Paper text:
AnCE is a single-domain protein, reported to have biochemical resemblance to C-domain ACE. The final structure contains a zinc ion, one inhibitor molecule, N-glycosylated carbohydrates at three potential binding sites (Asn53, Asn196, Asn311) and 201 water molecules. No noticeable conformational change is observed upon inhibitor binding. The topological arrangement of the final structure is consistent with previously determined structures of AnCE and AnCE in complex with captopril. The inhibitor SeCap molecule makes a direct interaction with the catalytic Zn2+ ion, displacing the water that is bound in the native enzyme (distance 2.7 Å), similar to the zinc coordination in AnCE–captopril. This interaction results in the formation of a zinc–selenolate complex. The carboxy-end of the proline moiety and the central carbonyl interact with the extended S1′S2′-binding site locking the inhibitor in position. The proline residue of SeCap makes important contacts with the S2′ subsite via two strong hydrogen bonds from two histidines (His497, 3.1 Å; His337, 2.5 Å). One oxygen atom of the proline carboxylate group interacts with Tyr504 (2.5 Å), Gln265 (2.9 Å) and Lys495 (2.9 Å) through hydrogen and ionic bonds.
Human angiotensin I-converting enzyme (ACE; EC3.4.15.1) is a zinc metallopeptidase that plays a critical role in blood pressure regulation by catalysing the proteolysis of angiotensin I to the vasopressor angiotensin II. Because selenium compounds are known to exhibit better antioxidant behaviour than their sulfur analogues, we have recently reported the synthesis, characterization and antioxidant activity of a number of selenium analogues of the clinically used ACE inhibitor captopril. Captopril is one of the smallest ACE inhibitors and with both ACE and AnCE, key interactions of the selenium analogue's central carbonyl and proline carboxylate anchor the inhibitor in the cavernous S1′S2′-binding site of the enzyme.
Residue numbers in the entry: 19 to 614
The structure:
Amino acid sequence: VKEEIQAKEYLENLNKELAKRTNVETEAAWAYGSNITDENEKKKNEISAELAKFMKEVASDTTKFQWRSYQSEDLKRQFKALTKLGYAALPEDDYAELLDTLSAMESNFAKVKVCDYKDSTKCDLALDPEIEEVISKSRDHEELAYYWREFYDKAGTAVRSQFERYVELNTKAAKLNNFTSGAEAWLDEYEDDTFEQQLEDIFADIRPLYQQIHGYVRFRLRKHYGDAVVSETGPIPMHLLGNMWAQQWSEIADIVSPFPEKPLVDVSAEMEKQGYTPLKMFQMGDDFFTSMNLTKLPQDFWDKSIIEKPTDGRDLVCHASAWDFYLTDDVRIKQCTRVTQDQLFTVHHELGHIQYFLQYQHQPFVYRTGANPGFHEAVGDVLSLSVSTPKHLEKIGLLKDYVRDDEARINQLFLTALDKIVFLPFAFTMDKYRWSLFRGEVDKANWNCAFWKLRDEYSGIEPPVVRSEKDFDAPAKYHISADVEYLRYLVSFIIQFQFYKSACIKAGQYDPDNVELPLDNCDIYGSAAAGAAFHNMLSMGASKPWPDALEAFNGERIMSGKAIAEYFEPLRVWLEAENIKNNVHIGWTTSNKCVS
Ligand SMILES: *[C@@H]1O[C@H](CO)[C@@H](O[C@@H]2O[C@H](CO)[C@@H](O[C@@H]3O[C@H](CO[C@H]4O[C@H](CO)[C@@H](O)[C@H](O)[C@@H]4O)[C@@H](O)[C@H](O[C@H]4O[C@H](CO[C@@H]5O[C@H](CO)[C@@H](O)[C@H](O)[C@@H]5O)[C@@H](O)[C@H](O)[C@@H]4O)[C@@H]3O)[C@H](O)[C@H]2NC(C)=O)[C@H](O)[C@H]1NC(C)=O
Ligand SMILES: *[C@@H]1O[C@H](CO)[C@@H](O)[C@H](O)[C@H]1NC(C)=O
Ligand SMILES: *[C@@H]1O[C@H](CO)[C@@H](O)[C@H](O)[C@H]1NC(C)=O
Ligand SMILES: C=C(C[SeH])C(=O)N1CCC[C@H]1C(=O)O
Ligand SMILES: [Zn+2]
């Protein structure tokens, strides 16, 4: 009770100390991600080991405080965050091995190089950008399969043994914190003992819509490739979906769009024609934020960021990332930026993270993070939703001669759906798979097909060629080799529509009883009211539980699929009718593609 006065001073000092200590770990991590070398790996891992040691002392020292006895919700909440040790709870030697494993994987992934399909001499092709360019633009189904195979063999199957040890150590670490496994560890970040159920329920409401999109896309792909490549009743061969992991299908919109003779938005060629640069694209992102009365990017951002792929022979992690350094105004992005419409969305996504950093940088160290991981992921996407509208793309002069009729509107809704709906069953399987390994629910002899079973069951997709337990495929996705929780993205795609809906209403850009203000053509650019709400929420960091953060934004406390259903309602109506009209088969048979 009266001990709380001394405890407050303890927290003030320790918070500031953790910030300064993390800053050093973060610089070392940045160094590695920007320049992968044996020497920089050593540094990175050794620094983190040192910080883990300090963390162990900190968790120990908290037991000197009767902190659960305290009056202040705020002090109790801060102390609680400090007891949460993570991997740091592992014994010295164990933590060292974990770190060496994580970087062995993350590095292997970033170092992947395949040979040219047309030329077995030219073997310096990397995922970003050589391979991803083919996956997104080639319509030679056999070339597509070739690249799919080479990549998965190298980014997935090579790190099997490493991944095995990683699950062991994650599990051990989780138990040392008295969680059942890493699943329950990850899920703790959401402060809600029913969070899993809530998601199952939401997915359940959304699933039928996904089913229809799946059916229609399969139908259209059959006309393009033939029935020899695409069956009517089988899962879709994933390598035809424009994307290496088939998480989003917007890259093949030119062949599966509802009205092929009406405008389909693809501003990449205009960006190039108008001489866009990575630097331009970021400056535009900056403009969007400042136009909403949010915070200008600081000078440290422009000085220290990496916004193009470096042209020395160096290895590096090209997967887009945003870094907070826990001082004042030292925030950065690393992105291997290309001049395309999707990349413009990515830029806004990453600047969403940066804005979050800046908004809560005045918070105590333990509150300098998302309300929950999903929130951090949503921020950028809320703006990207606006940026993607014809309304906005016409404004910045990238969309020309556009006629917004009923048919064009459907093409746009479908395009967004190939991004926003398609993704959801992907996001789920990502952690569903890992959760099941963490919880020890799959025998090691079953690990790979247990992956593809989930991809089948939820997404209705399957590998181009036959896989087995001789292959190991999950780490072919970045966030799996790099040990990054994925449920964040699912939470994001649900709640980003709650944010966007309410942002649009506050901007006077959405009225449901008004045909001239439709949610799917809302641009919040320049809205002070919208930015205001963002500020109220983002400036909180993790100071209160996420319910209180959402309440701050728009007065609501519940994660809901209502808003994302509201957005796509007009597409549902059209697509249900269209599938009936064309006698489109819905659903899929079990996949013959992973042998046990
Ligand atoms: C993971 O979950 C674990 C639960 O399984 C948990 O492990 C337990 O942590 C306990 C620490 O809180 C620890 O409890 C201590 O046990 C000592 C004796 O245990 C020994 O013999 C056991 C066999 O019988 C062995 O298995 C053990 O290895 C030990 O060798 C006790 O002597 C000790 O006591 C002291 O501390 C209490 C604390 O008092 C609290 O604070 C104030 C005092 O300042 C009190 O006023 C207040 O009321 C409050 O109770 C004192 O009361 C007492 O006088 C002694 O000073 C203590 O009970 C336990 O041993 C340990 N393991 C097991 C198997 O139980 C981990 O902590 C969890 N990890 C995380 C991250 O939470
Ligand atoms: C990468 O790190 C190495 C040492 O590991 C160093 O010699 C080199 O200068 C760095 N390269 C770049 C481009 O910074
Ligand atoms: C900008 O933000 C300030 C405080 O954050 C607020 O008072 C002001 O209304 C905002 N600007 C506009 C034009 O609304
Ligand atoms: C570029 C990012 C932001 Se860290 C990313 O990883 N994204 C953007 C949305 C989900 C996802 C992905 O790669 O799968
Ligand atoms: Zn992100």
